[PDB]
Amino acid sequence: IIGRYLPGTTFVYRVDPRAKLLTTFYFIIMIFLANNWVSYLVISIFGLAYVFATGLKARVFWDGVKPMIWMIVFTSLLQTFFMAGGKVYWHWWIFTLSSEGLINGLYVFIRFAMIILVSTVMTVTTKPLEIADAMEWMLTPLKLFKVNVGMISLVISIALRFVPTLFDQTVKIMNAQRSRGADFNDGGLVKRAKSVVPMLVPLFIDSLEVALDLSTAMESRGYKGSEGRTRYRILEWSKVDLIPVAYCLLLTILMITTRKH
Amino acid sequence: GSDNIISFDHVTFDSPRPALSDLSFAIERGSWTALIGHNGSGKSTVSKLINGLLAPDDLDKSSITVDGVKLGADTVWEVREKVGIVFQNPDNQFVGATVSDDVAFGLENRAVPRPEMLKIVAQAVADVGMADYADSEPSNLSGGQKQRVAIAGILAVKPQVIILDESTSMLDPEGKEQILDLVRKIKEDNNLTVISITHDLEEAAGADQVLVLDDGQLLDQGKPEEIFPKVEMLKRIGLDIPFVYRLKQLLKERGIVLPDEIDDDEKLVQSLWQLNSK
Amino acid sequence: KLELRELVLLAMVIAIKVILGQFKVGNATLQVGLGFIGSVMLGYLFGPWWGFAGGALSDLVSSVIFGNLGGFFIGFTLTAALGPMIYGFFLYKQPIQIWRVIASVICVTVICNIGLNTLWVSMMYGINFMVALSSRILKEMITPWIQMVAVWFILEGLSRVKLSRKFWS
Amino acid sequence: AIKFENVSYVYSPGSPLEAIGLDQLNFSLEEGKFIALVGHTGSGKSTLMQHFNALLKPTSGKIEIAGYTITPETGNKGLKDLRRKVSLAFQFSEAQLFENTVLKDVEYGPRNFGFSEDEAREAALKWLKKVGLKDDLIEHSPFDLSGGQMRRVALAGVLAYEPEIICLDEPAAGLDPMGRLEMMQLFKDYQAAGHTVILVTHNMDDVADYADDVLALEHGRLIKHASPKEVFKDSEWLQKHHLAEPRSARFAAKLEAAGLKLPGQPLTMPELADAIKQSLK
Ligand SMILES: Nc1ncnc2c1ncn2[C@@H]1O[C@H](COP(=O)(O)OP(=O)(O)OP(=O)(O)O)[C@@H](O)[C@H]1O
Ligand SMILES: Nc1ncnc2c1ncn2[C@@H]1O[C@H](COP(=O)(O)OP(=O)(O)O)[C@@H](O)[C@H]1O
Ligand SMILES: [Mg+2]
């Protein structure tokens, strides 16, 4: 289940990952401003345009939205019942379908859908290393606290490298324990709780040995702290990055004029 | 002229038994000195102590000198630039996110400008046989490929000594042979010194000088053709007798008489053929 | 501060938390994610504040490698950083006790799962606080009583591991 | 007995990444013999290993092992009794030690399979004595041990309940020659007790010395299944299929290239010495 990037040639794939992440963050921020049908239509048009500009099949968005469709439906219906009002179409003990209730449910569903679609667009069309580089770039202002962002970037880089390795080690450890009778999903609450130790303790031991070996390897190669080091992998801007700058900026107008002040 | 020289010293990590005790040896320049011993003999601590990761317990009588500079707290980061180590586990030492980044880690650490870094990394990656894998992730590579990346990263910063700390132990035999041949080619091309730390004596059979360790003490030293015939010492400390000498011992117990100078199996088979004349 | 070896161990624990975030235990309808276990590891081993860092980065790293389908937002990062902070406050250098486990689990599920997560879900999706809480409170009332037993056994195992030749204290 | 019918295992069925782990396999391994499973890296030895205890289930295949039958659609229920009779030790099994005590770690195996609190303890001490680990090291933490001692504990953990079939993935990879020989003789004596041992290894000397059958894989396809004196008979065949040959066999080939006759096939050192003695007789 590791790896969600899907290659493509459309102009979205060439946008700098920092600009793409900023566009995602700004879209999530701007969704907060939608409170009437005009603003929701505006965010709908802009989000759907951003989705179509990727060129991806709708199946990837459907696969991304499957894990949360129950949550979406439950939240929308409960908001419909709790914000009911106006014309009533079906009344029961507490369940009262209403025009305002349906409007609020549609609004909540739209917010869920477009947040999910923007997140899927960001995740699918960007390589994980580039997302990591963008995230490390956005941690630069923390230097005003004089925090060593070099160590933060090093920790993120090392942790992202070792998730695929430690996952396979976890699979190997589970298989080794199962081969001698371990049950990892049976036996009731206490036994299920106990069964996590055979998974975790050898994994922690492997993490210890990997930490020691990698620390020795890094120290032996001349590592003496993040101060005074150049970089090999860099992110650089282009012309295409003007597209998200306008796309956000234009949006910032269309919301402010149209939202119910 | 010796490249590495160590005067008698001992190191303790806190523990009753010191890991090393009065260790004293010299290593030539342009050699393939091989360090062999038990799995608790203190070879890895020697490797880590050569470049200054570890320090001797008494600086007033101990001495470590590499390339004519004496090792000390001030001199570390200068000896560490001249010697590089390729460790046992191929993937534990793989720090970069890709092959190119892993090779470029050492040059980043030395504040090399990026325009020169690109050329140096490309040349180092091309020196080993992984020109097309410059973007492969660590998990997409086998053990031999990751050891090639480690050797390329060590070669990028241009050291004068390469210490292979049981690098080929975790590889398949073909991977072992490929890595050893690559290291030999690199040593010949760049004129380096190679210190190979290994358990089995097959690798040490081609060495220019053999150092054998036990309980942190240098038990013997010399050419492989003069260390191996002392089979009783090898059996005493529990080491693999190499093929030719073990077979010669079995012929001894079988009653066949052969010269003691016999070596690599071609000489042995020709000796049997000339004996077959009678 | 932390030496290089301890920084690499912190990255290892962050990766372990990220991986455990994907593992579920339970029957066909009631499943609990093992992510909380990682948080305990960040609080038991590295203390209240460093675990906070390990809490935040683990949210970034996971979002990089498994995808943040729940919306790229900084509030969930703050919650994932705040959890291990409380766990470290309750468990860092103190001997393992039942009441520390009870208190740490209750406080984490009251401040992070209930509260902050509900507040940010409500703010993101426009619904008010009571709507968000009513759509969640079942899981946040069932799960802590399982997390208690799991955390007790994990702490026993980790205290077993720490007092060995492997750990370098 | 162990028997495979037409078996295939395909990693990630469908999908752009669809690697065929195993090809059409058809073989029968006789109970009570020593079998060495050989092949180059990436040949599918680990998948064939995991197929034995139904960790990996076939895709359009049938397996008959220890009386059990495994088919692609079989369920996870009832595999507890299969994994009691067919047990696997993985490569670097010492990494699985997690318990508070050496004795507790060794008896964690039998206890999972219904052994009582006394039977498990007695079996654990018996196998701790057998593997070579001495007495005072019991009641120690498994982590406060040497690598060889940790591996001995790990192997005693999977031999403690006397499984009928034991499958070992490179058991003596990093041990000393004394420990390596001790472990190999332990497995040979276990085989001589009536149980079946399946060894996955790259060392052809061990295959020549101990194995009774050799199971050769290439790219997930079974290429040969015969006695060691027949698998290593043709050097060019071994070279073609990425298979190595015993060092004793290499010396025999070189001596025959020198022209000296050697009766039989000296795959191990005593046989080579006797062959030389007969040649110069
Ligand atoms: N971190 C440590 N703290 C204390 N003692 C240690 C530590 N690491 C190793 N030792 C001990 O120091 C001695 C020397 O071990 P060393 O690592 O040098 O052995 P080796 O056989 O050369 O290793 P390798 O297999 O890595 O080549 C051994 O007795 C070992 O148990
Ligand atoms: N987790 C996996 N996912 C997909 N393909 C795999 C996986 N593991 C192995 N394979 C493929 O299946 C084949 C079987 O390899 P393996 O059984 O590991 O051989 P060996 O045990 O000799 O290394 C390999 O060639 C590999 O490409
Ligand atoms: Mg294998």
Residue numbers in the entry:
A (entry chain D): 5 to 265
B (entry chain A): 1 to 13, 17 to 281
C (entry chain C): 10 to 178
D (entry chain B): 2 to 282
Manuscript text:
Energy-coupling factor (ECF)-type transporters mediate the import of micronutrients, such as folate, cobalamin and pantothenate, in the majority of prokaryotes. A tripartite ATP-hydrolysing motor (ECF module), composed of a membrane-embedded scaffold protein (EcfT) and two cytosolic nucleotide-binding proteins or ATPase subunits (often hetero-dimeric - EcfA and EcfA’), forms a functional core complex with a membrane-embedded substrate-translocating protein (S-component). Structural and biophysical analyses of ECF transporter complexes from three different organisms, with different substrate specificities, and from different laboratories revealed that the core complex and minimal functional unit exists in a 1:1:1:1 subunit stoichiometry. Based on these fragmented structural insights, a model for the transport mechanism has been proposed in which a substrate-free solitary S-component with an outward-facing binding site topples within the membrane upon substrate acquisition, associates with the ECF module, and exposes the binding site to the cytosol, thereby moving the substrate across the membrane.
Accordingly, we incubated ECF-FolT2 with Mg-ATP and folate prior to sample vitrification. The S-component for folate (FolT2) remains docked to the EcfT subunit in the substrate-free inward-facing toppled state. The ATPase dimer adopts the open conformation, albeit with bound nucleotides. The nucleotides interact only with motifs from a single ATPase subunit and are separated from the signature motif (LSGGQ) located in the other ATPase. Notably, the nucleotide occupancy in the nucleotide-binding sites of ECF-FolT2ATP is asymmetric with ATP and ADP bound to the EcfA and EcfA’ subunits, respectively, which has been also observed in other ABC transporters. ADP is bound exclusively by residues from the EcfA’ subunit, and its presence suggests that ATP hydrolysis had occurred. In contrast, ATP remained present in the EcfA subunit, where the adenine moiety of ATP is sandwiched through π-interactions between Phe13 in the EcfA subunit and Arg174 in the carboxy-terminal end of the S-component FolT2. An indication from such asymmetry comes from the structure of the nanodisc-reconstituted full complex ECF-FolT2ATP determined here in the presence of ATP, resembling turnover conditions. Intriguingly, this structure adopts an open conformation, but where ATP hydrolysis has occurred only in one of the sites, while ATP remained associated with the second site, and was apparently protected from hydrolysis. We speculate that the S-component, which remains associated with the ECF module in the nanodisc environment, hinders the conformational transition needed for hydrolysis of the second ATP molecule.
